[PDB]
C-alpha cells in the first residue's frame, strides 16, 4: 500500500541512500540482517511502503542501487546494512563516466538504464499500489546527474501519474567539488524541470554551516551530512507512513507546494538540531521547533529566503503535540513575516502532524519551502555555465560523447525561463 521505489544513483546518491536506509530501518526496527527486532506494531503496520517481505519474514528494502562504477557498490555492500539490499538490485558498470553528464546520459547510461529499467519494472509490478518514486543523486556529478536524469525521464514516460520526487545535491556557491559542475548541473536541471514533481535542493555548504554552527561538530564527515538529508527524507515519508492527527502523503505535499508545474524546487529543513552540549539548556516545544525551522540558518540550501518570498511552505511535525500550538505558531510566523510570504496565496503553510517521533526524540519537524530564493541558486549556475560556455571550455568532452551545442543552449534557455518565472512570481 502506497509503496515507494527508491533509486540511488552515483556516489553521492548511494552514500545518502545508505544512510537513509539505516535511519529508516532504525525507525521500523529492522535488523541489519533484515529481521524485525522492534517493539511497537506501528512499525510493521506500514512496512510495505519501503520494504518487501521475503520468505523468512525478512524485509528487503525496495531500493535500486545504480552506479557506473563498482567501488561504491562494494563499499555499500561491505559496510553495515549492506546485507540488507537485494543482491539483484546492485546494477553497476565498469567505466565510471568520469564527471561527464554526456557519458552518463548517452553512452554508458544507455546500457545501464536498460538494465536498471528492467529492475525497476520488476519492482513496480511487484507493488500493490505504487505511490511514486524517490531518487537520490548529485547534479554536479557524473553518473549521478546524467543517469538520474535519464532514469527520471524514462520512468516518467512509463509512469506519468506517479509521484516522482528527487533529493538532489546541488552545487555549492563558494567551493566546487567538480570543475565541470555548471555543465552537469544545468543539463540536469533542464531535465528535472519537466520530469519531476518535487526536487529537494540540498547544498553541502549549507550542511557544513549547520554542522559547524548548530551542531558544533568539530570534524563533520559525510556521515553527518547524509544523516541530516536522511532525516529530512524520513520526516516526509514518515508523515506518509505512521498514523497521525493530520496525515499528508507525497501527493498532498506536491499539491500544496507546487502552484505551477515548473515551480517545484524546495529548500528542506529539520527543526530539532541541537549540539550535545546545549541539549540540556533547550526546551523542546512547538514554538522552538517552528522558530528553528523558519530560521534562514537552518535551511539546507545556500539560498537566503529573506532575498525572496515564500510561495508555499510545508511543516511536517512528528510526535505528540497540540494542534492548537502548531496552528498558532504557523499563524504567528505568517503574521510576523508577512513581507516574506506571497500575497496572492493566503495561508502559505501546509501542516501535517504524525504521532511517532524519530528515535531518540520527543518532538521533531521537517520544513519544506517553495520560495523564490532558489532563483539565486539557478542564477549562480547560469552565470557559471555561460562563463564556461562563452569561451567553450571543457565542451569537447560533451560534444565527443555525442551531444550538441544546441542542447546546451536549450538547457540554459530553460533555466533562464525558470529564473524568469521565479522572479515574476
Amino acid at each position: 500500500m502506497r509503496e515507494i521505489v527508491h533509486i540511488q544513483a552515483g556516489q553521492c546518491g548511494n552514500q545518502i541512500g545508505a544512510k537513509f536506509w539505516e535511519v529508516i530501518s532504525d525507525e521500523h526496527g529492522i535488523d541489519p540482517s533484515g529481521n524485525y527486532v522492534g517493539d511497537s506494531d506501528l512499525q510493521l503496520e506500514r512496512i510495505s511502503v519501503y520494504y518487501n517481505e521475503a520468505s523468512s519474514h525478512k524485509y528487503v528494502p525496495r531500493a535500486i542501487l545504480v552506479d557506473l562504477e563498482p567501488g561504491t557498490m562494494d563499499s555499500v555492500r561491505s559496510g553495515a546494512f549492506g546485507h540488507l539490499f537485494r543482491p539483484d538490485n546492485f546494477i553497476f558498470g565498469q567505466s565510471g563516466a568520469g564527471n561527464n553528464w554526456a557519458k552518463g546520459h548517452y553512452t554508458e547510461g544507455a546500457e545501464l538504464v536498460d538494465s536498471v529499467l528492467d529492475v525497476v519494472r520488476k519492482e513496480c509490478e511487484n507493488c500493490d499500489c505504487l505511490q511514486g518514486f524517490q531518487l537520490t543523486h548529485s547534479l554536479g556529478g557524473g553518473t549521478g546527474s546524467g543517469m538520474g536524469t535519464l532514469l527520471i525521464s524514462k520512468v516518467r514516460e512509463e509512469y506519468p501519474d506517479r509521484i516522482m520526487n528527487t533529493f538532489s545535491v546541488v552545487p555549492s556557491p563558494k567551493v566546487s567539488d567538480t570543475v565541470v559542475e555548471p555543465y552537469n548541473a544545468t543539463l540536469s536541471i533542464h531535465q528535472l524541470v519537466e520530469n519531476t514533481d518535487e526536487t529537494y535542493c540540498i547544498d553541502n555548504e549549507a550542511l557544513y554551516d549547520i554542522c559547524f554552527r548548530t551542531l558544533k561538530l568539530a570534524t563533520p564527515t559525510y556521515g553527518d551530512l547524509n544523516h541530516l538529508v536522511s532525516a529530512t527524507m524520513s520526516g516526509v515519508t514518515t508523515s506518509l507512513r505512521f498514523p497521525g492527527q493530520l496525515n499528508a502523503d507525497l501527493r498532498k505535499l506536491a499539491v500544496n507546494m507546487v502552484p505551477f508545474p515548473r515551480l517545484h524546487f524546495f529548500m528542506p529543513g529539520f527543526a530539532p538540531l541541537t549540539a550535545r552540549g546545549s541539549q540540556q539548556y533547550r526546551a523542546l516545544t512547538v514554538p522552538e521547533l517552528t522558530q528553528q525551522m523558519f530560521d534562514a540558518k537552518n535551511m539546507m540550501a545556500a539560498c537566503d529566503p529573506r532575498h525572496g518570498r515564500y510561495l508555499t511552505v510545508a511543516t511536517v511535525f512528528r510526535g505528540r503535540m497540540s494542534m492548537k500550538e502548531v496552528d498558532e505558531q504557523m499563524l504567528a510566523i505568517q503574521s510576523k513575516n508577512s513581507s516574506y510570504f506571497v500575497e496572492w496565496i493566503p495561508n502559505n503553510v501546509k501542516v501535517a502532524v504524525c504521532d511517532i517521533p524519530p528515535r531518540g526524540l520527543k518532538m521533531s519537524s521537517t520544513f519544506i519551502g517553495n520560495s523564490t530564493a532558489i532563483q539565486e541558486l539557478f542564477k549562480r549556475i547560469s552565470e557559471q555555465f555561460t562563463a564556461m560556455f562563452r569561451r567553450k571550455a571543457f565542451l569537447h568532452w560533451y560534444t565527443g560523447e555525442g551531444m550538441d551545442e544546441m542542447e546546451f543552449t536549450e538547457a540554459e534557455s530553460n533555466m533562464n525561463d525558470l529564473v524568469s518565472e521565479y522572479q515574476q512570481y
Binding site: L246, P259, W344
Partner: protein, 431 residues
Amino acid sequence: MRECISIHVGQAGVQIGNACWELYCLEHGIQPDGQMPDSFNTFFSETGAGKHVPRAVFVDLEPTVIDEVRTGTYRQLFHPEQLITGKEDAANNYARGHYTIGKEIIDLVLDRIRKLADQCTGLQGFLVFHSFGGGTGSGFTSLLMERLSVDYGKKSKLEFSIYPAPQVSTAVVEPYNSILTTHTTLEHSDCAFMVDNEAIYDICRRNLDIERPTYTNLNRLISQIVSSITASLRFDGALNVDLTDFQTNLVPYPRIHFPLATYAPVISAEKAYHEQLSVAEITNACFEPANQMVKCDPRHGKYMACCLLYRGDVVPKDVNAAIATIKTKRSIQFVDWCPTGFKVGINYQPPTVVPGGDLAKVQRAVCMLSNTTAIAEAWARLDHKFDLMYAKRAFVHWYVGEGMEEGEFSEAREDMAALEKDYEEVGVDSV
C-alpha cells in the same frame, strides 16, 4: 423507532465520531465492547444478545485513522464492515476525494448505508461529520451527500462541519476545498451546524483553564454539542425536538442554512464549585459573543433563528424568563422578519461527564444553534482568500489534473458570491 444514522468522513469526522460514540456509550451505560452490565435505539441496534452495534459508518480514504479505531478500546463495538477505508487519501484535494479516489469507494459506502437504513424502521435522517478544509472531508462528503439526496431524497441531512478558522489553519488549499464543498453540498443539504477549531481553543483557554489543549478536548466539546442536539431522540423531556424541528426552525431560506453551535456550561471543576450555574446564567453565557464556537462576532450581524436545547434540571418558567431577558437586551438584535426567533427544547437528562475529560459535572446545560448573518463575514473572508489564490491560479493544476475543470472553480466562486448576496439581502430590514 426514530432511528438516525451518523456518518463520519475523514480524519476530523472519524475522531469526532470516536469522541461522540465514547460519549454515547457512557450515557447509555454501554460497555466499550457493546455489552450492557429504548433510549439506546435511535443510535444503537441490538443483535440477539446484549451486543449493541452503533448505527454509524466510519468512512475515510486513508487506513490510518480507521485502523486506530479498529485497534483501540472500541475495537469490538463497531461492526467491522461499517468501518470503511481506502488505500490512498485525497491529499487535501477536493478533486481526489470527489472524482478520482472517492469514486472507488462511494458504492461501498452507499451499500453499507443502505444496509443500515434497511435495518431501521423509521429513519429520521443522517448526521454527517466532516471538515471543510480536507480532501475526503470535502470532496467525498459532497459526493456522498449528493448520492444520498438521489437515494433518500426526503430524509433530513444534518452535517457537523469544522469551518476553517479565520487565522489559524493547518492546510494551504483550504479555501479551494471549502468553496467547492459549499457549492456542492449547499445544493444538497438541509442545515450545517458549524464550528471552528480556533474558537474552541479560545473557549478552552478562557473557561477550562487548559493552556495546551489537543484535538481530543475539542472533539469532547463537539461531542457534548452533538449529545445535547440528539438528547431529545435519545431521552425524554418536557419539550422534545426532532431533526425536522431543527431543519424547520433554523433554515429560513433554502440556501441560508449555516447555524453556529454553542455550549454554555463549559467550566472546570473548581470554577463549577464556585458558581451557581442556573438557566439565566447559562443562557446569558450562550449569547455572550466570546462563548461562540465559531469565531464570528454575533454583534456584527442579526440573528434570524435560535434553538436553545436545555437539558437536566431545567424549569420551563426559568427558560421563559431567561429568553425574555435576552429579547429585552439591546446588544442582541434579530432580523425584523422573525418576531419569534426561539425554538426551545428541554430534556430531563443532565449531560454526562466523560471520565478523563475537563468539563465538570453540572446539573443543567444548554446548546444554542443560532442562524445569524454574522457568518456572512466569514464567507467573505473565505471567498477573498479563494479569489487571491485563484487570481494567481495557484494549486489549480493539482485540482485540474484530477478530473476537474477551471470552469468548476469559476462556477463555485459565482455560487459563493450569490450566497453572499443572499445573506446581504436577508440581512436588510423590510420597508
